[PDB]
Design a protein around this ligand. Structure first.
Ligand code: HEM
Ligand code: HEM
Lengths: 145, 145
């Protein structure tokens, strides 16, 4: 199933992912926090999963949230680096899913990250074309949940 | 404390970490798997913590082990990237510690990774000077467990 989702990552899709990541990944702390604070603002209900982070309204200044946000970006870095080898992408995606499955995060719940990603990409001037590419990457993860 | 341990990362220690990582981080899959197989060989008692991975003697052929090994390298990449800012290094280290604390991995247990790191580093022509540099980085994580 994960392999089938990975099949949607065509040559053009992988190219758009790498080009956008070249910019997005250049500031992991800034964009990582941007992803999270946008998620919490557009889908307040997701905050229920992050009680451990404490006062998330503090944003960047919250050490726990900042730590989580930076770390989140290295999972994407991992995914992006394995794009040319389906076997490695799949094993890393399934490895990543383990803890999220334990947390009872469904594919539908995980999909809520698409909105924030689209908004952050747009703030960097990466249009719908790029948003659709990232949605496909997220779909690979969703297939493992 | 983790804040006191982070201060132990002096100028030259950070420099040796970067120079060695430039080579070691070049092949995350190969070196990551080497780290793990060496750990399981020198400390068979730690295999119990990785029951989910299955037959760990299969090495590279074991998809779950390969997935974990590659992922492990991105945590180190994270640490190396935060060396410039002690505040970020600390929040990233504490974030990383959460799941290991939940698994009841003690500071002493975590320290068993020092052997494997020294051996892989030696196989790449990086001697004691570098092994000790990495031990100091590992000590920062140990302080958070
Ligand atoms: C593309 C998006 C995402 C990425 C790359 C990502 C990445 C990560 C990473 C690397 C970790 C640390 C390792 C672990 O514990 O598994 C993590 C932890 C976690 N993730 Fe995900 N995640 C994403 C989306 C989500 C979403 C949408 C939710 C919830 C609706 C979620 C909830 C969690 C929680 C609760 C933790 C633990 C936080 C803590 O207490 O420190 N993740 N995630
Ligand atoms: C250089 C040291 C190490 C690094 C960088 C590292 C990194 C990681 C990462 C990134 C994960 C995935 C995220 C998570 O679930 O927390 C993880 C999982 C894990 N780590 Fe650590 N780790 C290290 C050493 C150890 C040691 C020494 C043990 C115990 C003897 C250990 C036991 C575990 C276990 C059991 C898992 C879950 C494996 C699975 O079911 O997939 N780790 N570690």
């Amino acid at each position: 199933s994960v392999y089938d989702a990975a099949a949607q990552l065509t040559a053009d899709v992988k190219k758009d992912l790498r080009d956008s990541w070249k910019v997005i990944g250049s500031d992991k702390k800034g964009n990582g926090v941007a992803f999270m604070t946008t998620l919490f603002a557009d889908n307040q209900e997701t905050i229920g999963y992050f009680k451990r982070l404490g006062d998330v309204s503090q944003g960047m200044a919250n050490d726990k949230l900042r730590g989580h946000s930076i770390t989140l970006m290295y999972a994407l870095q991992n995914f992006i680096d394995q794009l040319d080898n389906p076997d490695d992408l799949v094993c890393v995606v399934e490895k990543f899913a383990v803890n999220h499955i334990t947390r009872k995060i469904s594919a539908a719940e995980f999909g809520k990250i698409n909105g924030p990603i689209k908004k952050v990409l747009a703030s960097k001037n990466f249009g719908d074309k790029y948003a659709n590419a990232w949605a496909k990457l997220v779909a690979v993860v969703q297939a493992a949940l």
